Amino acid sequence: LHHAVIPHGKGGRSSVSGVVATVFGATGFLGRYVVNHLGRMGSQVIIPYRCDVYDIMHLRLMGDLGQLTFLEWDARDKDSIRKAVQHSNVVINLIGREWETRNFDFEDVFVNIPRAIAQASKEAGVERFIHVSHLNASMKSSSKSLRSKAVGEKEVRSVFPEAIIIRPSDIFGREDRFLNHFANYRWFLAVPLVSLGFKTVKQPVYVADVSKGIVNATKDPDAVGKTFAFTGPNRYLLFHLVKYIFGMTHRTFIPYPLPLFVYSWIGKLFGLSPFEPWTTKDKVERIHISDVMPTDLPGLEDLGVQPTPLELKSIEVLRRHRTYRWLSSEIEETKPAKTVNY
Amino acid sequence: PTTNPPTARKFIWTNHKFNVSATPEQYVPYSTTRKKIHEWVPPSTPYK
Amino acid sequence: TYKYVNKKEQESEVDMKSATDNAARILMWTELIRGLGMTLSYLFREPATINYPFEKGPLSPRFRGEHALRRYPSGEERCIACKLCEAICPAQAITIEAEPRADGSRRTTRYDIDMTKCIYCGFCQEACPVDAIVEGPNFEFSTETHEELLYNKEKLLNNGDKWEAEIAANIQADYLYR
Amino acid sequence: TSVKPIFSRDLNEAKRRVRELYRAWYREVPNTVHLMQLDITVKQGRDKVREMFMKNAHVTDPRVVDLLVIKGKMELQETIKVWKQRTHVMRFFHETETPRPKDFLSKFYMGHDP
Amino acid sequence: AASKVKQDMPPPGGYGPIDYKRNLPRRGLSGYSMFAVGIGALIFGYW
Amino acid sequence: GVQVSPSGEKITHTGQVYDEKDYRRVRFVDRQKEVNENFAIDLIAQQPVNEVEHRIIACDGGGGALGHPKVYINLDKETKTGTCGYCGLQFKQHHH
Amino acid sequence: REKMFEFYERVSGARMHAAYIRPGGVHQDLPLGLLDDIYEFSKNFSLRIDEV
Amino acid sequence: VYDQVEFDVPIGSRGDCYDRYLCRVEEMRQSLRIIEQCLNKMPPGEIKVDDA
Amino acid sequence: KRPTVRPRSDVTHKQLSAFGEYVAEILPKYVQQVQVSCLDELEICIHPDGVIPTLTFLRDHTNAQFKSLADLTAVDVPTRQNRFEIVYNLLSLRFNSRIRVKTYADELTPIDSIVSVHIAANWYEREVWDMFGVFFFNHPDLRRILTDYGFEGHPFRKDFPLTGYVELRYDDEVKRVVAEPVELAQEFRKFDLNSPWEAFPAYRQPP
Amino acid sequence: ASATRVIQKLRNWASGQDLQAKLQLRYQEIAKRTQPPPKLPVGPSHKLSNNYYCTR
Amino acid sequence: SRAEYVVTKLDDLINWARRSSLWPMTFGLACCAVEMMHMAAPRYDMDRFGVVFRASPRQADVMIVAGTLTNKMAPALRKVYDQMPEPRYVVSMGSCANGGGYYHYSYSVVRGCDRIVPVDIYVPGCPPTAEALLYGILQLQRKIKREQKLKIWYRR
Ligand SMILES: CCCCCCCCCCCCCCCCCC(=O)OC[C@H](COP(=O)(O)OCCN)OC(=O)CCCCCCCCCCCCCCCCC
Ligand SMILES: NC(=O)C1=CN([C@@H]2O[C@H](COP(=O)(O)OP(=O)(O)OC[C@H]3O[C@@H](n4cnc5c(N)ncnc54)[C@H](OP(=O)(O)O)[C@@H]3O)[C@@H](O)[C@H]2O)C=CC1
Ligand code: SF4
Numbered sequence A: 001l002h003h004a005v006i007p008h009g010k011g012g013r014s015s016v017s018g019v020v021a022t023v024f025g026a027t028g029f030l031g032r033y034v035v036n037h038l039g040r041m042g043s044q045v046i047i048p049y050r051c052d053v054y055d056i057m058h059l060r061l062m063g064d065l066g067q068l069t070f071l072e073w074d075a076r077d078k079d080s081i082r083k084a085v086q087h088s089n090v091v092i093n094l095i096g097r098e099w100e101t102r103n104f105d106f107e108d109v110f111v112n113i114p115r116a117i118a119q120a121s122k123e124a125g126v127e128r129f130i131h132v133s134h135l136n137a138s139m140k141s142s143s144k145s146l147r148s149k150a151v152g153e154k155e156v157r158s159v160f161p162e163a164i165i166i167r168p169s170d171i172f173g174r175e176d177r178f179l180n181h182f183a184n185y186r187w188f189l190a191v192p193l194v195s196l197g198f199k200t201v202k203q204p205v206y207v208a209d210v211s212k213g214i215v216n217a218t219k220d221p222d223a224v225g226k227t228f229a230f231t232g233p234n235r236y237l238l239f240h241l242v243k244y245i246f247g248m249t250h251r252t253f254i255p256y257p258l259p260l261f262v263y264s265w266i267g268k269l270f271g272l273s274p275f276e277p278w279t280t281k282d283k284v285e286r287i288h289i290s291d292v293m294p295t296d297l298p299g300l301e302d303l304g305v306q307p308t309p310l311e312l313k314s315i316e317v318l319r320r321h322r323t324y325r326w327l328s329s330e331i332e333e334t335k336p337a338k339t340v341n342y
Numbered sequence B: 001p002t003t004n005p006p007t008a009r010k011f012i013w014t015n016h017k018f019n020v021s022a023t024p025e026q027y028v029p030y031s032t033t034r035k036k037i038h039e040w041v042p043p044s045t046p047y048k
Numbered sequence C: 001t002y003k004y005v006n007k008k009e010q011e012s013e014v015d016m017k018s019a020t021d022n023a024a025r026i027l028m029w030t031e032l033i034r035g036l037g038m039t040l041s042y043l044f045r046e047p048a049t050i051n052y053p054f055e056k057g058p059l060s061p062r063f064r065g066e067h068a069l070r071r072y073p074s075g076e077e078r079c080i081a082c083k084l085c086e087a088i089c090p091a092q093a094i095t096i097e098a099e100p101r102a103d104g105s106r107r108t109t110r111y112d113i114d115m116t117k118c119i120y121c122g123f124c125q126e127a128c129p130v131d132a133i134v135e136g137p138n139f140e141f142s143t144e145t146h147e148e149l150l151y152n153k154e155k156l157l158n159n160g161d162k163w164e165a166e167i168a169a170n171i172q173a174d175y176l177y178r
Numbered sequence D: 001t002s003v004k005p006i007f008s009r010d011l012n013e014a015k016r017r018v019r020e021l022y023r024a025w026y027r028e029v030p031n032t033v034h035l036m037q038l039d040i041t042v043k044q045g046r047d048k049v050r051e052m053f054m055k056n057a058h059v060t061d062p063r064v065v066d067l068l069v070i071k072g073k074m075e076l077q078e079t080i081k082v083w084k085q086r087t088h089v090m091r092f093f094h095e096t097e098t099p100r101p102k103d104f105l106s107k108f109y110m111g112h113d114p
Numbered sequence E: 001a002a003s004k005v006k007q008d009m010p011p012p013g014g015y016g017p018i019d020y021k022r023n024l025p026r027r028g029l030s031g032y033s034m035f036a037v038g039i040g041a042l043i044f045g046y047w
Numbered sequence F: 001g002v003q004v005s006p007s008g009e010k011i012t013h014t015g016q017v018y019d020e021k022d023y024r025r026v027r028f029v030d031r032q033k034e035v036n037e038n039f040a041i042d043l044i045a046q047q048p049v050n051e052v053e054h055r056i057i058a059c060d061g062g063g064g065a066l067g068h069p070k071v072y073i074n075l076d077k078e079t080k081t082g083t084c085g086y087c088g089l090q091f092k093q094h095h096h
Numbered sequence G: 001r002e003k004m005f006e007f008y009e010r011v012s013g014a015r016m017h018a019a020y021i022r023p024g025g026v027h028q029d030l031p032l033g034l035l036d037d038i039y040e041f042s043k044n045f046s047l048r049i050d051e052v
Numbered sequence H: 001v002y003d004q005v006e007f008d009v010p011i012g013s014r015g016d017c018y019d020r021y022l023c024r025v026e027e028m029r030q031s032l033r034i035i036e037q038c039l040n041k042m043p044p045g046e047i048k049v050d051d052a
Numbered sequence I: 001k002r003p004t005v006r007p008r009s010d011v012t013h014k015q016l017s018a019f020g021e022y023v024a025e026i027l028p029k030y031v032q033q034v035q036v037s038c039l040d041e042l043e044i045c046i047h048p049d050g051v052i053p054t055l056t057f058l059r060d061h062t063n064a065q066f067k068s069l070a071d072l073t074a075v076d077v078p079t080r081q082n083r084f085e086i087v088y089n090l091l092s093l094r095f096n097s098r099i100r101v102k103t104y105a106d107e108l109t110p111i112d113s114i115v116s117v118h119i120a121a122n123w124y125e126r127e128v129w130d131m132f133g134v135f136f137f138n139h140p141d142l143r144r145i146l147t148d149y150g151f152e153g154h155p156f157r158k159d160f161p162l163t164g165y166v167e168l169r170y171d172d173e174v175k176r177v178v179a180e181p182v183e184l185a186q187e188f189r190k191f192d193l194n195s196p197w198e199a200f201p202a203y204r205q206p207p
Numbered sequence J: 001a002s003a004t005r006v007i008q009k010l011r012n013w014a015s016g017q018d019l020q021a022k023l024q025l026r027y028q029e030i031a032k033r034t035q036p037p038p039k040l041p042v043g044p045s046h047k048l049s050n051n052y053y054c055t056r
Numbered sequence K: 001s002r003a004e005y006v007v008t009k010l011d012d013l014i015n016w017a018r019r020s021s022l023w024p025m026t027f028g029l030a031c032c033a034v035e036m037m038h039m040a041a042p043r044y045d046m047d048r049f050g051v052v053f054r055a056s057p058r059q060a061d062v063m064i065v066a067g068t069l070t071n072k073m074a075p076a077l078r079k080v081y082d083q084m085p086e087p088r089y090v091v092s093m094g095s096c097a098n099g100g101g102y103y104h105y106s107y108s109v110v111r112g113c114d115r116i117v118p119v120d121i122y123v124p125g126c127p128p129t130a131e132a133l134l135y136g137i138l139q140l141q142r143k144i145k146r147e148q149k150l151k152i153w154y155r156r
């Protein structure tokens, strides 16, 4: 270890961790938690951003002086990546997107960009490269995002064979697109589900556990070159999950069945939004795709994390949707969701 | 200063710069010191 | 001695004239019309507003703003690492590390000032026995980053090499009063 | 061995006071998880109350116990009234403090601290 | 030339005299005047 | 002078520069490293020796109360030159 | 208040927090021409008190 | 040097916000009265104790 | 006559000493070690059982009308077994004189409140409690006054570190302000400044 | 001073005072910004005889 | 008639509005609030620049942390900031707010408001000359001049 990387201190905001990370995608739902957990134990975080400097403020405070170093980059410009990974010992590609744009395709974000980042990280002397694929990812899935993600992790491993690949499930938090989505269906007065939610399984995990797992894989020497499956402890059926949601939200739950060949058309329409669409055909298909069973893959308890069940961390997400009549309602008033094995 | 001008000194700048914050050509702080403690340089030969 | 502010009131004597005057005051709002007149007078006065950043507020040579390390006219640094400046700095903002320069002189390697800790008190420039550290006149040195406000030897030396034409004159003006 | 007593001339009366205080806290927890909109259950709060109480179970001087009860009543006042926000209440749970291990060997691997 | 002690001392004879007492002046009409004006205006308007 | 290192970073008058493998050079990415190009050692070397006809000379720097405390320097050793401890001015006994 | 801050600044260097009064007296004598300005300010301040 | 400078203390009768406001205004006026004297009679000499 | 030294009058010394004799012989049950200083200031030290009687006498008695409680302080001296030196500075408008009354306390040795005498002492006693840990009796509302709402410790105790034990920040994870153990980027620098040469031989402590 | 003999009358009547003689602005009635150099005095303890710090 | 040019001009307009109308919040903690006032005073007329102190956070656009931030006050500061609606900027005024300042090593001071909220501009001084605080306001104006949000949206 270089004399400036030896860890010193007790693991506080002003300590040293020995970690010099370059986090691609820090301006997202998960990147902010990752950067918080990194700057919390005194590590250097290099945060390349394409967005406006006004959208990195919430990050500017989650690290001591000099621990956060921001940079302007572009996915197409390869030098923008070399300059970022030029001094790191870790790289964390969280780049992703739940919809395609005028200028970017699922392929572009899930295959090429990770592949270039990995080429540069390898050529630059990086020791670790953490990639975040999906749990349900496969070259044989109906959704295009999952096919692209599987191809992308294949390429990342063909360019960086020691790349830690992390495969989480539908993540839930405050700024998420899963519980807030299943809560905001209410604006349409009813919940359209395929097969009435049955036949579908969801094993969701809290984002803080995922960030802890990433930050611990940063410095866990038994994790190099391994795949992980970050999944929650309990499996649910989409029906009972959404019912528990509307219970915490205390809204009226009117579920009706809906075949997928019209729900996907609905999703296309909604996706035509030139802004951030409220839903998409790919987000639809990603829903209603059952959740793979652990199938021997390592996990959070092997990284050093005890998963947090949804029944403890749902209200801090779903109290924002309640009305004045139900705000103060406690957690125990809501009947928990049925758990399954399948 | 057109009548009572300052005194001439080599080290004085000949081109004044404005506040250069949030740009390149700005100020980044660093340690002006050298290493205090030096590590042992392991040999390039094995014991055999 | 002392005086009364609201005891002036003496025993009550009232006439028809006094009653009518108080009545007009109460009915025509005399005393308020006078405040209206004052505010009117102020409307037709010249405002004290300066046109910043073109014309600026006055100052005096003694103004203590941004710090700078000076030099002798030969270019040699005035600091000798005596450390009075950090020994008295009541904010513990100064940090110094000295070492014999190759030529043997007593000079610094580190001279840092956390300008987020400085209270801009001036004790360092009145303690410096060589008039090396000063608190210059510049106050327009705000930043977009906290790190920029943690000055080191090079920053202060550059400031000194930037403001000397002004620092030296203000000193020449004020150094008899000290 | 002879001193002035604050309130209790023996440990049993101090224990009576401690029990009164435990009852007050046990009864209050629900009202303040409702009011402060805390995102915890009512059982976690009472477990935390019991833990903070046991934190000082080793005391035997009635004066220390009386002062601890005074401090606890001060806090219970600050909480019954909403003078303190959910921040100060969740300070008790230390949700962010990375828990230092009691394993000699881990303490050895990270740092020189005993 | 030479050099005597120089100091921001007041000028010989002292500074001018400073005003510090209240001078809220006295103005206005007589009261009877105000009421007469108002009453005459009312009467003319009524006519 | 301001010499550069194999990494391009400039070496300050303190001899400080980051090693090529040091991660602490990200702070200078898309930014600059502030150094003072006027090294006082070279400058005070560029000044000449002030001869004197007295064995003991004083040095207040210059400007009187604008310089440094007045120190007195012995100049017996004709091979060496006396250097002020505050400034770096050199003095030599003219007649030796 | 701004003019009196100017007095401060002239005599101390700071407008507001002048560490000027110190055990033994004051750090630094008055600068030439300050008492005149104080007189010019005091000869008029009464008028502003009257306005208020 | 108070006890070398003459001034009047303003005093209220009804302990209300009005009497206090008047007391403050008149204390400002008396501060002017005091500044006049401090200006006219300011002695020469040093400013800090002659004990180094 | 000398311009640097401070003019000293013995008349006030005599006045205050006579009044100290007065107080000592009129309250023998409580008074300890009356004393007067080179600077003219009267200091009456007492047993804490005498707080209320002493202060009430000094407020109500005719030759002593100290009916304005200027200050109320404490002083930690960890050496002595009773650390806290509680101080009552008082003022007589009728005689234009001041006086100071002192007691002593401990971590586990509380005293009585004087809000029945001087209502000005409510907040001052709350401050003493918050800062040093001294508990007062029969206080209407004794809580914290200056410290945070969940603050542990009494910061003015010499044994309490200047920088404390915790430190606050904002955590996006929980979306709250949290308290973490202290960790500084620059540690406070302790300067040993005491000269090793006796400076005032009038206060020399014989061995 | 820039006023013009009519606004002055108006505002003096409205306020009831002679403002033109007492202005909130400083027109060259102030000490300069470049004063000569001073020659400060010295205190009493600057003698060379009968000045022993044990006395004072 | 390129959409990129049109978007650049539209963003210029957006920023001009949000810039020439900056309504701060009546939030002053310590001495530095006095220089805030003085910057509201005739010599430096704030409204001259479009600046107006509104007392409700739900109406303000920026908050100047004008003094020392204690641990007993940080929750309220973060709450108020949270309650300010985006776009929201922050200005640290003085040395107490930037890094604790003269009270950095105290047990009841946060060593920088940048720990509790994110700061756009730092104004040094103890206290900062009102002229300096105005310099900082205009520095903020320019920073807003350089937001380029809609260009980013169009490039996405
Ligand atoms: C033969 C005749 C037959 C006809 C019959 C009629 C005869 C004429 C009678 C004239 C009567 C006078 C006109 C009545 C209006 C005034 C009413 C009034 O006097 O109210 C006074 C009220 C109390 O004042 P106060 O000092 O507190 O006394 C309290 C009692 N102890 O305080 C007030 O109400 C006033 C305070 C209001 C403050 C608000 C701000 C006022 C702003 C002043 C603006 C003035 C400009 C006017 C513009 C008008 C143009 C439309
Ligand atoms: N439900 C979830 O959140 C799940 C997440 N994951 C994985 O986690 C990762 C992040 O999730 P999340 O953070 O929620 O995604 P977000 O959309 O919340 O943020 C993703 C990041 O991708 C960056 N990004 C996307 N496209 C580009 C581009 N073309 N150029 C530059 N930057 C780009 C964005 O930067 P900007 O926003 O500034 O453009 C943003 O910071 C993704 O890779 C996803 O596959 C896995 C399973 C489920
Ligand atoms: S002005 Fe005062 S606080 Fe600032 S660096 Fe100098 S001595 Fe320290």
Ligand code: SF4
Binding pocket: C078, C079, C080, C081, C082, C083, C084, C085, C086, C096, C124, C127, C128, C129, C130, C131, C132, C133
């Ligand atoms: S007081 Fe002056 S000479 Fe001494 S260490 Fe400080 S800057 Fe250098």
Ligand code: SF4
Binding pocket: C119, G017, K030, K031, K032, K066, K067, K068, K093, K094, K095, K096, K097, K101, K102, K125, K126, K127, K128
């Ligand atoms: S920085 Fe100085 S002026 Fe500003 S609040 Fe702190 S102590 Fe007061």
Ligand SMILES: [Zn+2]
Binding pocket: F059, F060, F061, F068, F084, F085, F086, F087, F088, F089
């Ligand atoms: Zn010299």
